Amino acid sequence: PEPQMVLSPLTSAAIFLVVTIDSGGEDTVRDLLSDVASLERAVGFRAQPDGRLSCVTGIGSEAWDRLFSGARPAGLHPFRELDGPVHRAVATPGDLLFHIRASRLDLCFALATEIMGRLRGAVTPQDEVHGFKYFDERDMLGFVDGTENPTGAAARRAVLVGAEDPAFAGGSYAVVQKYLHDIDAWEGLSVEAQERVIGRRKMTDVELSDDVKPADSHVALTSVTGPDGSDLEILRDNMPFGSVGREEFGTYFIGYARTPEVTETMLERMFLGTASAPHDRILDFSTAVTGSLFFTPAADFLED
Amino acid sequence: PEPQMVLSPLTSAAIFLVVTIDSGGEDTVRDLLSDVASLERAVGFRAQPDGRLSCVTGIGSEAWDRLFSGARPAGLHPFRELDGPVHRAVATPGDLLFHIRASRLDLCFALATEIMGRLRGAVTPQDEVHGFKYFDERDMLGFVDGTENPTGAAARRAVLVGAEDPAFAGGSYAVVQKYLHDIDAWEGLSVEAQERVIGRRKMTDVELSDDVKPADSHVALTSVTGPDGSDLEILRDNMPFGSVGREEFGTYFIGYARTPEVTETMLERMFLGTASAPHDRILDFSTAVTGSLFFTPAADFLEDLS
Amino acid sequence: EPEPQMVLSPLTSAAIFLVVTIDSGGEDTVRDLLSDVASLERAVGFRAQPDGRLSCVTGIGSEAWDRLFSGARPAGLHPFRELDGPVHRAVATPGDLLFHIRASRLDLCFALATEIMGRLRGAVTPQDEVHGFKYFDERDMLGFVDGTENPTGAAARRAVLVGAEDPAFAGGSYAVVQKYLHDIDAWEGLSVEAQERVIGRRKMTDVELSDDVKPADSHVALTSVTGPDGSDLEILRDNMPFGSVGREEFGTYFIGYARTPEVTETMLERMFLGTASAPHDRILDFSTAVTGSLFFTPAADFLEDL
Amino acid sequence: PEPQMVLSPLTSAAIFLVVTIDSGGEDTVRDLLSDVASLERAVGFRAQPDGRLSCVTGIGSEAWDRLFSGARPAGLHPFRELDGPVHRAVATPGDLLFHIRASRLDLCFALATEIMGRLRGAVTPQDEVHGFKYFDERDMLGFVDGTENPTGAAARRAVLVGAEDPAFAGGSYAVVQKYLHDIDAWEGLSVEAQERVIGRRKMTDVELSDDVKPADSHVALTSVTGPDGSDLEILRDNMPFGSVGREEFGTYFIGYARTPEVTETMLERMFLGTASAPHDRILDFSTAVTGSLFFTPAADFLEDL
Amino acid sequence: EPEPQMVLSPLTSAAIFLVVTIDSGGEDTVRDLLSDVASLERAVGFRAQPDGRLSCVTGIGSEAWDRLFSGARPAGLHPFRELDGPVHRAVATPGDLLFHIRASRLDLCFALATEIMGRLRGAVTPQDEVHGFKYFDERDMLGFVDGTENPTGAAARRAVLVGAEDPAFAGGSYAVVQKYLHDIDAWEGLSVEAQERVIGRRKMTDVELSDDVKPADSHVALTSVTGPDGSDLEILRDNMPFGSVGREEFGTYFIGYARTPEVTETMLERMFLGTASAPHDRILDFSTAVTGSLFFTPAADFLEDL
Amino acid sequence: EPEPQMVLSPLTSAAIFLVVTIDSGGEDTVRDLLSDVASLERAVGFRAQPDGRLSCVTGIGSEAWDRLFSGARPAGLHPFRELDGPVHRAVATPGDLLFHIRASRLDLCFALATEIMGRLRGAVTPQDEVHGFKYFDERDMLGFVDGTENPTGAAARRAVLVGAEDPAFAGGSYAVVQKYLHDIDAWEGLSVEAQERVIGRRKMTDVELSDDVKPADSHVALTSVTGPDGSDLEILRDNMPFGSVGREEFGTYFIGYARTPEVTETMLERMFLGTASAPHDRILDFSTAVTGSLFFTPAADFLEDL
Numbered sequence A: 001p002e003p004q005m006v007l008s009p010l011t012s013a014a015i016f017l018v019v020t021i022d023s024g025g026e027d028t029v030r031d032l033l034s035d036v037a038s039l040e041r042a043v044g045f046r047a048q049p050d051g052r053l054s055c056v057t058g059i060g061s062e063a064w065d066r067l068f069s070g071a072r073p074a075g076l077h078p079f080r081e082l083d084g085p086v087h088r089a090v091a092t093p094g095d096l097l098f099h100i101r102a103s104r105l106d107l108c109f110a111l112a113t114e115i116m117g118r119l120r121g122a123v124t125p126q127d128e129v130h131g132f133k134y135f136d137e138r139d140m141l142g143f144v145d146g147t148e149n150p151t152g153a154a155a156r157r158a159v160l161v162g163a164e165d166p167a168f169a170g171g172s173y174a175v176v177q178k179y180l181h182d183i184d185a186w187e188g189l190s191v192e193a194q195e196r197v198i199g200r201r202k203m204t205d206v207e208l209s210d211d212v213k214p215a216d217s218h219v220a221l222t223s224v225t226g227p228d229g230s231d232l233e234i235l236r237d238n239m240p241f242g243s244v245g246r247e248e249f250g251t252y253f254i255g256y257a258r259t260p261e262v263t264e265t266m267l268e269r270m271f272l273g274t275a276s277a278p279h280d281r282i283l284d285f286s287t288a289v290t291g292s293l294f295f296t297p298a299a300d301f302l303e304d
Numbered sequence B: 001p002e003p004q005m006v007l008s009p010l011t012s013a014a015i016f017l018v019v020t021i022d023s024g025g026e027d028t029v030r031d032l033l034s035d036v037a038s039l040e041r042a043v044g045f046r047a048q049p050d051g052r053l054s055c056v057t058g059i060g061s062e063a064w065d066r067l068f069s070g071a072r073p074a075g076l077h078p079f080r081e082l083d084g085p086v087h088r089a090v091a092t093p094g095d096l097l098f099h100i101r102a103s104r105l106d107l108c109f110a111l112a113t114e115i116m117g118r119l120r121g122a123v124t125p126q127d128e129v130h131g132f133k134y135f136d137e138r139d140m141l142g143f144v145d146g147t148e149n150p151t152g153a154a155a156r157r158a159v160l161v162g163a164e165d166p167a168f169a170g171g172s173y174a175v176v177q178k179y180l181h182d183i184d185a186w187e188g189l190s191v192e193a194q195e196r197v198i199g200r201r202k203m204t205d206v207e208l209s210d211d212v213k214p215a216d217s218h219v220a221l222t223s224v225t226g227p228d229g230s231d232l233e234i235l236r237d238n239m240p241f242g243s244v245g246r247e248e249f250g251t252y253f254i255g256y257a258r259t260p261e262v263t264e265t266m267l268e269r270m271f272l273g274t275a276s277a278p279h280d281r282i283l284d285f286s287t288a289v290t291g292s293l294f295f296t297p298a299a300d301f302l303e304d305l306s
Numbered sequence C, E, F: 001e002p003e004p005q006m007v008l009s010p011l012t013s014a015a016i017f018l019v020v021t022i023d024s025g026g027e028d029t030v031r032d033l034l035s036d037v038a039s040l041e042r043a044v045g046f047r048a049q050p051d052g053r054l055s056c057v058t059g060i061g062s063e064a065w066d067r068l069f070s071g072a073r074p075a076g077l078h079p080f081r082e083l084d085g086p087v088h089r090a091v092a093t094p095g096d097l098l099f100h101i102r103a104s105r106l107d108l109c110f111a112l113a114t115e116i117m118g119r120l121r122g123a124v125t126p127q128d129e130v131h132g133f134k135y136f137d138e139r140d141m142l143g144f145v146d147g148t149e150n151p152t153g154a155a156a157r158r159a160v161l162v163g164a165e166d167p168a169f170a171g172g173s174y175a176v177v178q179k180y181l182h183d184i185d186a187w188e189g190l191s192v193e194a195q196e197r198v199i200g201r202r203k204m205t206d207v208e209l210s211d212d213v214k215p216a217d218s219h220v221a222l223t224s225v226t227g228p229d230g231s232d233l234e235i236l237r238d239n240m241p242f243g244s245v246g247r248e249e250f251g252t253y254f255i256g257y258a259r260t261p262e263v264t265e266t267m268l269e270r271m272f273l274g275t276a277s278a279p280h281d282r283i284l285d286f287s288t289a290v291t292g293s294l295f296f297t298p299a300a301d302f303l304e305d306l
Numbered sequence D: 001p002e003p004q005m006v007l008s009p010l011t012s013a014a015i016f017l018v019v020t021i022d023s024g025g026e027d028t029v030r031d032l033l034s035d036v037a038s039l040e041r042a043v044g045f046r047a048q049p050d051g052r053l054s055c056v057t058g059i060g061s062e063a064w065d066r067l068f069s070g071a072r073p074a075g076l077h078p079f080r081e082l083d084g085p086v087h088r089a090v091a092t093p094g095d096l097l098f099h100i101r102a103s104r105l106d107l108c109f110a111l112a113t114e115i116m117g118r119l120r121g122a123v124t125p126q127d128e129v130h131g132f133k134y135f136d137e138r139d140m141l142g143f144v145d146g147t148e149n150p151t152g153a154a155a156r157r158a159v160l161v162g163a164e165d166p167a168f169a170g171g172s173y174a175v176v177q178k179y180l181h182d183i184d185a186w187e188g189l190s191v192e193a194q195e196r197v198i199g200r201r202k203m204t205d206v207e208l209s210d211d212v213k214p215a216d217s218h219v220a221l222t223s224v225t226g227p228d229g230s231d232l233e234i235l236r237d238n239m240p241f242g243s244v245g246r247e248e249f250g251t252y253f254i255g256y257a258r259t260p261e262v263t264e265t266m267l268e269r270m271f272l273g274t275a276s277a278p279h280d281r282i283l284d285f286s287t288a289v290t291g292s293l294f295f296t297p298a299a300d301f302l303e304d305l
């Protein structure tokens, strides 16, 4: 089975589009799903090889039941709200996700325009974010963002559904959350204090040693080991976004995994805490304003 | 006199930031203006040579009077509203313009962030546009955009103030207008009908011959000759922008010239018409929602302040 | 695991197509060159890596095969079959060897062509030599994007490379070439909308026409073929413009690779002879074939071990 | 005055087009000349900044008098044939030259197509060459080609007409010659012998010292000093071309200069020789099959027609 | 199943070779660094992706292996074997750990080397450090293209990676290093044709000399080796120039990877000890080896699991 | 118009600094090489254009000038003046000729250095050779962006090139070089904010500290100098990192160009001897100078006419 382009090369621009399916819009959606790979080639082919345009399409739990009969993917459910002692991870509506990436924002925009052109009248937009990465892979907090992502075979094993759910092999599960940052409070920390929040050195991106790394740092809480002592991994492609005039400085989080269990365990540690950590210190500078979960099928499932 | 980077190499990303100066905000603004070139180097130097980051700072007519107590540039006045039989060019508030360009949007954003950080509490944002050019220099209507801009010495002569206003030599005048397009109506035209609106072939960007080019085409109405029969030219760096969710498809128009009279003559022909043309046909698919005029001083004028 | 030639190449902007016949007595000289052609490709190309992207694919015709080699023949190798349609004809022309040379620059193609022809001088007769160049946005001489629906990855290897069905020749492929000359004056008298109906895709944006509007005699409709089992039958194409402005020659050099010639031949029959719903491919009202040849391109190790 | 793009950045592709003007063709030609700069922007602008497309347009001596009334450039005359003891520099017909350059051949071809489209029925093609430079600036003989071209202000001084002919300031003079090489004979020389023909080391492109450089080497014979002891310089943009099937291996020579007398003095030394040298040894491997001279006006002269 | 180190790297234009010995008592510190070296590589390199192309290959010598690890040894691991020929000598020099660091820029190599040696200060003693750079046309200090006949693709993986013959160490490789200094004055007194007879390929065009004219004591002839079964035995080389113009040091740093050391050592025996028809490799009359060491480069997951 | 050497070069990522002394009797050989150095630069660099950006700036010291030439001397040419401060010392070390070689790749630098030293063999003795590399974000070995406040354009030409104040030497410049080694262990024991107070700019973003927080003994405060007439006195710097990981040598090679040595010397005095409000430049508590030399870099045509 041929996957979507979940494992993409590095891209410096993205558009995230989240929409809901209106009553009566199902047929128009199904038609667009069967064409979206052909649209990606149409927009992207003439700008190769620099363009690096791809679209990953996802489907939510409620929408799945409206669109398709027969089997459901084993791990597909609505995003679970987390109500922690201090911080909350909200659930927001979303039936379809389009994760569009390229080396330039204009290519993303052209593909987004063709997709939304086909869906006008059948869907209602819930969110639209235009992301850009800083030239040294830094995020809005000034830290390098992406470093410990898996690559090669390890990435395929962490991300792609396999024999455990064979009708949906080559699919993946995506979790999205839009975060807004309090940059004034963040910039009042010393660099060393910022390093203790994240768990890595700021300039050089070397991980803090085990003897200095706090238990409530982002890296400590999002490190999870499985039954057998192995690392449970996800693939992230976080993007900055914002608006200088409205004082909006953001990170759009997207995490792909072979089962939602990995990602959800990470989120529970961050928002609910553990015995050794009240919560992830990154959340004292970061508020989640969306939250949704999608299944991204194999490409050939959509092509039918 | 050293000009600002009005004549920039080609860039694929931009931020246009227009603000008003709040009462009492003058001193904070003057401070920032004296530092803006140093901020441009701080953000941009470490991303050389590919970053191509620049900022052009402009000052409106009313803002000028509040900030500076001596001589005014000869051509600086508020944007003049044009109230045509069908189409209108609105005047909207704007005291400062920052026209920020680079090869990547993140560099523009970082500079904009440092600028606005210094001005917080002294200004009110009026408009913010993040622009991106299509990879083949096309605009949102699908036409190549920039082709007949002047280059080299011809560009310097068309854009930079000289002997005619010697205390402001090395300056320029910028007009900005944000346009929203009706793309559904545009896409209902045949290609040949689109070509008759613009005045050039769509795929190849060859100009239509004098015998076929209509009098109400964009190229015909924005072609202007001077007293002496020479072409009057401006330098444009138009940028697409928009939001697919809200169905907003735009062109952010910016035109630089040595005197505003050139730009204003073009706008009068577009909105009020001529003997042979009621108005520029591009306006049947394009609505102006902002309009402002700014003087962009020489770099050394900004540096030598308090 | 047999190693194919570079049939699946990255995108290249230049090519040389060389077709020759083997003179009486030339067989031994040809066999020697075939055993060295991969080493010649590395010699010319290695020092221009990684930007040069030089490759050579070598093909052998049906009659030449019998003169060069004893033993097994590839199952699908035969001479190109003439198609004599009601209006349009696909000619067969002689060719014993093909050299399909590709790079990012024409000079690298030329240097390899020079070394190859240097070794063969006196043993072969040139039949055709074309120097091809792709336009910067992947467009062909008709102004349309060309290559968009080619298969990639695993699907390309499945469509192109001989496998278990002919195991002695696994890793090989079959190439069909046809040189086409266009009537550009007649083409350019069509509106863009009428050109789109000929091809089956939008010209500027390269989006396929919807199933309800795509004509039955459009190029895309006629070259879309489904198998017994309802799967798409695919080929890999690397069409190249060529020409001479002085002689008014504006061409497309067609080359198509497939695992069996049956797929390509079925496409040709539909284009030239038509179907129940279509007299012929409308692209042929603007395009005349002046060559036609079929070659087997062996696995690289077959050539090395000879 | 704004010159044409005679001083171009380095380009790896070119098309050279030479045509004659048919009976009655003058009006069509003048129309095209007034549009050629706008055609160059139309084809080139959307491929910037990598495309690097330019067109330099030249006009021959006889064609000048047919197209324009009034003043003539002072140095414009027909190419002068040189009939040497062994080698000959031929003159061939040519009224218009289009020297088209870009980073890629397809851009050159698109501009050539629009130009020839406008001239169909008014001109007759005499020569069409598609040139390509090797990736390390080498020519068909395997030597680096372009090294001692002038640059910056020295190039402007060597190439552009100035005060000496003020109505035509910003123009230049181009000489073209297509050469075919005997590659079999060249490749039978040792590298060291080829170096003695050229006057520079082959791999490293270092000039041979004055005490080793033979007097009949290409570099020695094309090194010319003026009245004042100053070097006389031209700007060259030689391009390989050919056809493997026809065994055609060529260099298309083009040289620009402020007056044709510099280039013509170089040609006399190559073909007729000096006291110490019978002829340029490069000509024992290189035969000229075309030769023409053109004036390339300032851009604004063409625009105003 | 096993993940190899980046032995099969893309082409890189810079490198650092660092060879150290492990001081008495330094074993625990070294083991800790080995378990972190892939994490350090990502830390330095991720922010320069995708153009940085930073990798480190870590090797372990025969004596050091016994000090660091208990259990199985790789089958082919032994100390480099000194070769004492009649004229030329291949010396053995001490070396416990190799770090073969490659990128598109020297600063990335340098930053990673700085982090590695930072962790190891006090536990190791440096024996050699070389900063290599490629000439722009892949030439070495002798003026010849260097790398041309390296295997690529599947053939490279087969030639380089340990497989089923030693399954506990599958995905590993064996590296031989030798630093060579050249006598450039003597080399440059040869004619080009005499240089070509030393190497066995043409200098400017890199075409191999024909079998009839290639000397038996040329570098290419002596390093071409066939197996019992008729097949070519191949290695993967990534030779780098280095030197110092003030001290008249012009060098080639030799590094050769192979699935078993026997292939590389057979090549070295032919070069230094000769054959019946060749006393020695003529390249050694202009090249002196001043180091020689052999290392096993384990699979990446072997290092991670420490 | 006197033609300067390439003192104002585009940004380069590699350099070689070569300092030599002229042996007794070596004068004639040196004069011959000086008359050829621009020809050597074109020979090596032409075939790598336009990306190579190879240039060589040649300097001559005070004592060497008097050995090579007769007549008038440049007005400001003297040997480097040793500074003996209370804590820190700026040493003077020997040097007759400087070759400042820059390019986008080290191999071009190396090839030109090789041809230069080839011509001078036997007539000079090497004193210093440094191969420099810039970090990818223009950072130096202390982790700060280095070169941000250099002047550019016309302001750089005014700061650097000799003019009417010394008209026989117009178009020349004066270069001061100092090799510095850093104590990185001590530097890395500071917090980032303490590092920022040493330099006078923020580390990650390279924004200058406000005048109310910037210490008087910071690097930027002590190297900011105004003239009698209120103007900034500027120099043009092209500092390069260098080092050796095995020897724990981490360096900055300082080179500063100016129209008169007095500007550079005033800055050095402030750094090493202090002012009323500052004992010394705090950068020197982590940085030791181990060389110091001063050279005049003549106009290009002065070298040619030898």
Ligand code: HEM
Pocket: A139, A141, A143, A144, A145, A146, A147, A148, A149, A177, A179, A198, A200, A218, A219, A222, A223, A234, A236, A238, A251, A253, A255, A263, A266, A267, A282, A286
């Ligand atoms: C405000 C939102 C976020 C920001 C600004 C952010 C930023 C970062 C940074 C800077 C790192 C260190 C470098 C690296 O990418 O390895 C990191 C690591 C990581 N983050 Fe986040 N992150 C955010 C949210 C999340 C969320 C919501 C999850 C999981 C649900 C997550 C999972 C991870 C993981 C798994 C790593 C790798 C940890 C390791 O194993 O070393 N992050 N993040």
Ligand code: HEM
Pocket: B139, B141, B143, B144, B145, B146, B147, B148, B149, B177, B179, B198, B200, B218, B219, B222, B223, B234, B236, B238, B251, B253, B255, B263, B266, B267, B282, B286
């Ligand atoms: C919706 C807003 C606009 C769009 C999309 C637009 C687009 C274009 C296009 C596609 C061209 C032809 C190619 C070229 O030379 O750039 C053009 C030319 C031009 N436009 Fe606009 N334009 C707009 C508004 C304006 C305005 C407001 C002015 C002046 C106030 C203006 C002045 C010009 C000029 C001077 C030319 C050059 C005509 C010539 O000399 O050939 N445009 N524009």
Ligand code: HEM
Pocket: C140, C142, C144, C145, C146, C147, C148, C149, C150, C178, C180, C199, C201, C219, C220, C223, C224, C235, C237, C239, C252, C254, C256, C264, C267, C268, C283, C287
């Ligand atoms: C004058 C000669 C030709 C021209 C200019 C040409 C041009 C084109 C163009 C523009 C397309 C659309 C974009 C794309 O998918 O590449 C196309 C598609 C295609 N052409 Fe051609 N074509 C030529 C001859 C041929 C011939 C001779 C064949 C087969 C024997 C062929 C087979 C195809 C196929 C299979 C497709 C893809 C159809 C699909 O599945 O969507 N073409 N060609």
Ligand code: HEM
Pocket: D139, D141, D143, D144, D145, D146, D147, D148, D149, D177, D179, D198, D200, D218, D219, D222, D223, D234, D236, D238, D251, D253, D255, D263, D266, D267, D282, D286
């Ligand atoms: C027959 C084909 C020709 C070839 C292949 C050729 C090749 C070369 C080569 C390799 C160089 C040395 C590197 C360089 O400085 O460019 C050179 C230099 C030069 N050639 Fe040619 N050339 C040819 C014809 C001509 C002609 C016809 C002229 C003059 C009318 C000419 C004038 C020169 C000049 C002036 C130089 C620079 C000399 C100096 O160092 O000052 N060449 N040529």
Ligand code: HEM
Pocket: E140, E142, E144, E145, E146, E147, E148, E149, E150, E178, E180, E199, E201, E219, E220, E223, E224, E235, E237, E239, E252, E254, E256, E264, E267, E268, E283, E287
């Ligand atoms: C001074 C040290 C060396 C230099 C400058 C050098 C240089 C070269 C050059 C120029 C070639 C021809 C082009 C190529 O295929 O890469 C070559 C090929 C080769 N070298 Fe070396 N080499 C050196 C040492 C060694 C050593 C020590 C070995 C083995 C232990 C070796 C093994 C090979 C092999 C296997 C080939 C490919 C031969 C073939 O099958 O065509 N080299 N080398």
